[PDB]
Design a protein around this motif. Structure first.
Motif, PDB file in Angstrom:
ATOM      1  N   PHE A  64       0.858  -1.195   0.000  1.00 25.47           N
ATOM      2  CA  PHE A  64       0.000   0.000   0.000  1.00 25.47           C
ATOM      3  C   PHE A  64       0.879   1.224   0.000  1.00 25.47           C
ATOM      4  O   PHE A  64       1.938   1.275   0.590  1.00 25.47           O
ATOM      5  CB  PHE A  64      -1.007  -0.005   1.145  1.00 25.47           C
ATOM      6  N   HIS A  65       0.405   2.272  -0.691  1.00 27.74           N
ATOM      7  CA  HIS A  65       1.088   3.533  -0.768  1.00 27.74           C
ATOM      8  C   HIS A  65       0.264   4.599  -0.085  1.00 27.74           C
ATOM      9  O   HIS A  65      -0.924   4.745  -0.407  1.00 27.74           O
ATOM     10  CB  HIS A  65       1.326   3.950  -2.238  1.00 27.74           C
ATOM     11  N   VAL A  66       0.872   5.377   0.800  1.00 28.37           N
ATOM     12  CA  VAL A  66       0.290   6.596   1.310  1.00 28.37           C
ATOM     13  C   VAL A  66       0.869   7.703   0.489  1.00 28.37           C
ATOM     14  O   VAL A  66       2.095   7.921   0.501  1.00 28.37           O
ATOM     15  CB  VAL A  66       0.524   6.797   2.818  1.00 28.37           C
ATOM     16  N   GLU A  67       0.025   8.435  -0.223  1.00 29.55           N
ATOM     17  CA  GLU A  67       0.442   9.464  -1.164  1.00 29.55           C
ATOM     18  C   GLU A  67       0.252  10.843  -0.577  1.00 29.55           C
ATOM     19  O   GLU A  67      -0.717  11.079   0.164  1.00 29.55           O
ATOM     20  CB  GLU A  67      -0.322   9.355  -2.463  1.00 29.55           C
ATOM     21  N   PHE A  68       1.140  11.766  -0.953  1.00 29.74           N
ATOM     22  CA  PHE A  68       1.124  13.135  -0.501  1.00 29.74           C
ATOM     23  C   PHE A  68       0.999  14.082  -1.688  1.00 29.74           C
ATOM     24  O   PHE A  68       1.368  13.768  -2.802  1.00 29.74           O
ATOM     25  CB  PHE A  68       2.434  13.486   0.244  1.00 29.74           C
ATOM     26  N   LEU A  88       8.949  15.029  -0.426  1.00 27.32           N
ATOM     27  CA  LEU A  88       8.198  13.825  -0.050  1.00 27.32           C
ATOM     28  C   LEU A  88       6.966  13.705  -0.903  1.00 27.32           C
ATOM     29  O   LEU A  88       6.187  14.646  -1.060  1.00 27.32           O
ATOM     30  CB  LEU A  88       7.754  13.955   1.414  1.00 27.32           C
ATOM     31  N   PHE A  89       6.729  12.486  -1.410  1.00 27.63           N
ATOM     32  CA  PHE A  89       5.516  12.210  -2.189  1.00 27.63           C
ATOM     33  C   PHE A  89       4.782  10.957  -1.780  1.00 27.63           C
ATOM     34  O   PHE A  89       3.596  10.847  -2.145  1.00 27.63           O
ATOM     35  CB  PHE A  89       5.774  12.258  -3.698  1.00 27.63           C
ATOM     36  N   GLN A  90       5.408  10.024  -1.084  1.00 28.92           N
ATOM     37  CA  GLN A  90       4.746   8.749  -0.792  1.00 28.92           C
ATOM     38  C   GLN A  90       5.520   8.029   0.295  1.00 28.92           C
ATOM     39  O   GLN A  90       6.755   8.192   0.349  1.00 28.92           O
ATOM     40  CB  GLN A  90       4.727   7.957  -2.102  1.00 28.92           C
ATOM     41  N   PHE A  91       4.850   7.234   1.101  1.00 31.53           N
ATOM     42  CA  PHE A  91       5.545   6.213   1.855  1.00 31.53           C
ATOM     43  C   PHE A  91       4.808   4.896   1.717  1.00 31.53           C
ATOM     44  O   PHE A  91       3.632   4.809   1.383  1.00 31.53           O
ATOM     45  CB  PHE A  91       5.790   6.589   3.322  1.00 31.53           C
ATOM     46  N   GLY A 126      11.931  18.627 -11.656  1.00 32.61           N
ATOM     47  CA  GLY A 126      10.601  19.155 -12.011  1.00 32.61           C
ATOM     48  C   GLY A 126       9.430  18.248 -11.715  1.00 32.61           C
ATOM     49  O   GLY A 126       8.390  18.749 -11.299  1.00 32.61           O
ATOM     50  N   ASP A 127       9.518  16.940 -12.242  1.00 34.12           N
ATOM     51  CA  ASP A 127       8.479  15.908 -11.936  1.00 34.12           C
ATOM     52  C   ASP A 127       9.080  14.672 -11.287  1.00 34.12           C
ATOM     53  O   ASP A 127      10.254  14.517 -11.298  1.00 34.12           O
ATOM     54  CB  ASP A 127       7.383  15.735 -13.007  1.00 34.12           C
ATOM     55  N   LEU A 128       8.278  13.810 -10.696  1.00 28.15           N
ATOM     56  CA  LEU A 128       8.693  12.483 -10.293  1.00 28.15           C
ATOM     57  C   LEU A 128       9.139  11.640 -11.495  1.00 28.15           C
ATOM     58  O   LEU A 128      10.146  10.912 -11.409  1.00 28.15           O
ATOM     59  CB  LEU A 128       7.561  11.815  -9.594  1.00 28.15           C
ATOM     60  N   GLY A 129       8.388  11.646 -12.590  1.00 28.90           N
ATOM     61  CA  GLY A 129       8.710  10.809 -13.712  1.00 28.90           C
ATOM     62  C   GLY A 129      10.053  11.154 -14.307  1.00 28.90           C
ATOM     63  O   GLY A 129      10.814  10.263 -14.704  1.00 28.90           O
ATOM     64  N   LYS A 130      10.341  12.463 -14.414  1.00 31.98           N
ATOM     65  CA  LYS A 130      11.652  12.893 -14.878  1.00 31.98           C
ATOM     66  C   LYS A 130      12.777  12.434 -13.909  1.00 31.98           C
ATOM     67  O   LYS A 130      13.857  11.781 -14.307  1.00 31.98           O
ATOM     68  CB  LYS A 130      11.664  14.395 -15.171  1.00 31.98           C
TER      69      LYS A 130
HETATM   70  N1  LIG Z   1       2.163   5.862  -5.291  1.00 35.49           N
HETATM   71  S1  LIG Z   1       3.392   6.637  -6.001  1.00 35.49           S
HETATM   72  O1  LIG Z   1       3.048   8.031  -5.822  1.00 35.49           O
HETATM   73  O2  LIG Z   1       4.639   6.094  -5.641  1.00 35.49           O
HETATM   74  C1  LIG Z   1       3.457   6.203  -7.768  1.00 35.49           C
HETATM   75  C2  LIG Z   1       3.482   4.842  -8.106  1.00 35.49           C
HETATM   76  F1  LIG Z   1       3.424   3.853  -7.171  1.00 35.49           F
HETATM   77  C3  LIG Z   1       3.540   4.456  -9.435  1.00 35.49           C
HETATM   78  F2  LIG Z   1       3.548   3.120  -9.715  1.00 35.49           F
HETATM   79  C4  LIG Z   1       3.591   5.408 -10.470  1.00 35.49           C
HETATM   80  S2  LIG Z   1       3.664   4.805 -12.172  1.00 35.49           S
HETATM   81  O3  LIG Z   1       3.043   5.928 -13.057  1.00 35.49           O
HETATM   82  O4  LIG Z   1       5.142   4.900 -12.633  1.00 35.49           O
HETATM   83  C5  LIG Z   1       3.053   3.177 -12.736  1.00 35.49           C
HETATM   84  C6  LIG Z   1       1.654   2.981 -12.174  1.00 35.49           C
HETATM   85  O5  LIG Z   1       1.615   1.798 -11.406  1.00 35.49           O
HETATM   86  C7  LIG Z   1       3.574   6.795 -10.176  1.00 35.49           C
HETATM   87  N2  LIG Z   1       3.637   7.763 -11.253  1.00 35.49           N
HETATM   88  C8  LIG Z   1       3.800   9.200 -11.040  1.00 35.49           C
HETATM   89  C9  LIG Z   1       4.435  10.121 -12.068  1.00 35.49           C
HETATM   90  C10 LIG Z   1       4.759   9.775 -13.402  1.00 35.49           C
HETATM   91  C11 LIG Z   1       5.316  10.752 -14.287  1.00 35.49           C
HETATM   92  C12 LIG Z   1       5.581  12.101 -13.860  1.00 35.49           C
HETATM   93  C13 LIG Z   1       5.245  12.460 -12.525  1.00 35.49           C
HETATM   94  C14 LIG Z   1       4.682  11.467 -11.667  1.00 35.49           C
HETATM   95  C15 LIG Z   1       3.515   7.174  -8.803  1.00 35.49           C
HETATM   96  F3  LIG Z   1       3.487   8.500  -8.482  1.00 35.49           F
END
Ligand SMILES: NS(=O)(=O)c1c(F)c(F)c(S(=O)(=O)CCO)c(NCc2ccccc2)c1F
Ligand SMILES: NS(=O)(=O)c1c(F)c(F)c(S(=O)(=O)CCO)c(NCc2ccccc2)c1F
Ligand SMILES: [Zn+2]
Length: 258
Positions: A64-68, A88-91, A126-130
């Motif tokens: 489970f993820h707690v998201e911020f 911080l974004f998640q634990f 800038g982003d998490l994905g980056k």
């Molecule tokens: N709960 S979490 O915030 O850690 C989380 C994930 F667990 C997670 F699996 C993903 S995921 O998109 O890579 C695959 C989905 O299972 C993201 N994605 C956030 C994100 C992506 C691109 C740019 C910014 C944020 C994500 F943010």
């Protein structure tokens, strides 16, 4: 036939879909305490969680993820080994079927009952994905859990789990203060590593606190009632969602203390 923690899809299988599983900076590792060298150049970690805004709790299938809210610069991690500001974004946690296993990192081969990971992304990307595409994109603060007295600040997490039993369920989870999950001391070990499950990206500076927190048997037992499966699918208890220690390879673990 997606990755998981079982025989048929677990850690020994991940390299087929994710070959970096056999990379040069994989996590977790065993923390050999006698070999980790005090580094007087390390800084006293700055963990500033006063403004953290929790949003939601989500059963992601393997945890489970707690998201911020990570849309403005709130809760952050800086200092120690880090250059710049990590948000911080998640634990989440990893835990065992038994009190004697569950942590990802080990300490002189000791396993803890569970391990808390607080994940942060480097605001300069800038982003998490980056950030996840950079070798210094993430910083994960790891905290060991041992079974003993209850952790008051964990109980709100434990109590919501019945609402997110199965994969894909989410619940509102506002106003949770992650400062209640931290041990007294910020003494830590640090090394360069990776995400501990797929996609295993080599993007993480690990900061593992020496001091565990204490949780009760009943708290961890409730984590073990979660399900890996979705609603309507065969029940598989969510236990043993940890990757074993990986080869240290060309790395040094550095201690902030002693
Ligand atoms: N709960 S979490 O915030 O850690 C989380 C994930 F667990 C997670 F699996 C993903 S995921 O998109 O890579 C695959 C989905 O299972 C993201 N994605 C956030 C994100 C992506 C691109 C740019 C910014 C944020 C994500 F943010
Ligand atoms: N255990 S860990 O802290 O290293 C970890 C992972 F191993 C991991 F794979 C992920 S994930 O979201 O890529 C896959 C589902 O948990 C996250 N979550 C935080 C994160 C989110 C996006 C990119 C990088 C990290 C994550 F935090
Ligand atoms: Zn984790």
């Amino acid at each position: 036939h997606h990755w998981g923690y079982g025989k048929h899809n677990g850690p020994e299988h991940w390299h087929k879909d994710f070959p970096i599983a056999k990379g040069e900076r994989q996590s977790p590792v065993d923390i050999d305490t006698h070999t980790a060298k005090y580094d007087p150049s390390l800084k006293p970690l700055s963990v500033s969680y006063d403004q953290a805004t929790s949003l939601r709790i989500l059963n992601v299938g393997h945890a489970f993820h707690v998201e911020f809210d990570d849309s403005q610069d709130k809760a952050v991690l800086k200092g120690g080994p880090l250059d710049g500001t990590y948000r911080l974004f998640q634990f989440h946690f990893h835990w065992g079927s038994l009190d004697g296993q569950g942590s990802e990192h080990t300490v002189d081969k000791k396993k803890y009952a569970a391990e808390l990971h607080l994940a942060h992304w480097n605001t300069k990307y800038g982003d998490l994905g980056k950030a996840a595409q950079q070798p210094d994109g993430l910083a994960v603060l790891g905290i060991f859990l041992k079974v003993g007295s209850a952790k008051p600040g964990l109980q709100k997490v434990v109590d919501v789990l019945d609402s997110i039993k199965t994969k894909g369920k989410s619940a509102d989870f506002t106003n949770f203060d992650p400062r209640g999950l931290l041990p007294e001391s910020l003494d830590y070990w640090t090394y360069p590593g990776s995400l501990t499950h797929p996609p295993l990206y080599e993007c993480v500076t690990w900061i593992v606190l020496k001091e565990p927190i204490s949780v009760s048997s009943e708290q961890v037992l409730k984590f073990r009632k979660l399900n890996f499966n979705g609603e309507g699918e065969p029940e598989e208890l969510m236990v043993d969602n940890w990757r074993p220690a990986q080869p240290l390879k060309n790395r040094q673990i550095k201690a902030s203390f002693k």
